[PDB]
Design a protein around this ligand. Sequence first.
Ligand SMILES: Nc1ncnc2c1ncn2[C@@H]1O[C@@H](CSCCNC[C@@H]2Cc3ccc([N+](=O)[O-])cc3CN2)[C@@H](O)[C@H]1O
Ligand SMILES: Nc1ncnc2c1ncn2[C@@H]1O[C@@H](CSCCNC[C@@H]2Cc3ccc([N+](=O)[O-])cc3CN2)[C@@H](O)[C@H]1O
Lengths: 265, 255
Amino acid sequence: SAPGQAAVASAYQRFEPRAYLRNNYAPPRGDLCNPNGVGPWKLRCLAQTFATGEVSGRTLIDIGSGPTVYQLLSACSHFEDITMTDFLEVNRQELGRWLQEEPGAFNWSMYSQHACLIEGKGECWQDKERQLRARVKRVLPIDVHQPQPLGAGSPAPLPADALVSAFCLEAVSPDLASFQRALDHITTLLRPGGHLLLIGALEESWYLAGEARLTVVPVSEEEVREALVRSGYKVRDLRTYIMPAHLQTGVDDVKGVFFAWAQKV
Amino acid sequence: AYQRFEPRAYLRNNYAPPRGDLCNPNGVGPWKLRCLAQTFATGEVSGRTLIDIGSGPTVYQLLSACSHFEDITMTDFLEVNRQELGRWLQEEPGAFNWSMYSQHACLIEGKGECWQDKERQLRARVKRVLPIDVHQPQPLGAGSPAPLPADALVSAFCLEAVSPDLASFQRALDHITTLLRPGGHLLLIGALEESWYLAGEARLTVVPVSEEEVREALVRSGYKVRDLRTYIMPAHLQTGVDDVKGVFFAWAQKV
Ligand SMILES: Nc1ncnc2c1ncn2[C@@H]1O[C@@H](CSCCNC[C@@H]2Cc3ccc([N+](=O)[O-])cc3CN2)[C@@H](O)[C@H]1O
Ligand SMILES: Nc1ncnc2c1ncn2[C@@H]1O[C@@H](CSCCNC[C@@H]2Cc3ccc([N+](=O)[O-])cc3CN2)[C@@H](O)[C@H]1O
């Protein structure tokens, strides 16, 4: 078990946040004007799920935030305490730049505007970002391969009412078995009856983050569903987006994207 | 007097904060955008061609209009305003940033449209920017490139701001009304009970008008008033740039 993990940790030492941001969150993949694009689909899954009112509580943990905040734009009106996490210091620093409203931070304002647009409440994007910054109460190291991903007696309020995780588990797991165990490990962080929102890449074997070319376990929708069931979830929603050819740039070999809403039993 | 009008001062006074803060939905900017959006959302204001009367250096007043009219003419009395418009239309250097207004129009309209697509459509549909003088019986002169008669007019904060008194305001309205097809629509926005405003070195005289006065003026020009509403200016938006008391929005139909 330890070998595959050592390979993952080593490969991530070359991960370049800015290149990763450019590849995935600037145009063309970061084009929010095309409703058929992947950015709008992700934001829609999240906004629609939170719009049900069924996913709420006091505390939320984002698992493997990397250098991004988009996955929390709709969530942040429903949780007063948000923990963001990442394995890499360089990503935690990138989140820090953004938290401090630095220029030189990545500009999420197009995503914030798009979230305001689809949430349909007339909120301005500046109020949305102010609220996300207020509700993020800590940014913590994490390793999903450890039985306690946050370490012993972490700062984070546990158990959490909800988890969010985008493009983390399949990107740090050498094989399906590692992915299943990682899912079990983060599932310990979640209250029974709590909710997990999982976004990830389907049938991907690599992606680029600068010099770093990371190896990814290719997973199918069926594999994700079965993993959720095995970890003790009821699957409420599991959607697939098929990556259009024009978005099939050379930054990865992804075939689609999945969104799962699961409730822990 | 208008010869000392400074577009950048005017923009700063009226379209930068506090008056240009769009975050609070009780502000004047959001109220104006809502009047315009709700009106066009009815479907009753439609056609091929539209003229914006006295555009000055602003485009917000056409953000909801532009998806209902394929040919748009913008107008102003002053070359310096016409150049400021040109800088924004051609995406030139130092153009005013209207993106907050574009974004808010998209939010209000509720169609999920992105603000870059809205600006793109506005820029595509504005075919020309022309001189205009509403004091002339033919405000656009004879044989102007503008298709006439227009199917719709929009005019925000022009007639009361260029008229010394109610009689002049009425005549200016009669004048622009000749540009409008019978059965066509006028969307008129303006200041209530204002007597002056500043634009840098220019101090401009305004005729103070009431809601009743505007209604009466419309009827006299031959319009049926479909809608007329008032925004009362809150104290935190009462700055030193004018003495405005309120803003009116009128939707009128020529008959
Ligand atoms: N042991 C660990 N525990 C927790 N997190 C860890 C661990 N090791 C690395 N990490 C952390 O997880 C990393 C996750 S970044 C996302 C990687 N996903 C792969 C790739 C990216 C991507 C992104 C967006 C889209 N899209 O279309 O919107 C598609 C794709 C294609 N897939 C990173 O922050 C790393 O630092
Ligand atoms: N003879 C003419 N014919 C046509 N246009 C002409 C003529 N002479 C001058 N012009 C043209 O008309 C002008 C219109 S802009 C200034 C209007 N002044 C009213 C002032 C501005 C304002 C704006 C917004 C708000 N608000 O709270 O939303 C409040 C206020 C307060 N009132 C200007 O572009 C000028 O160039």
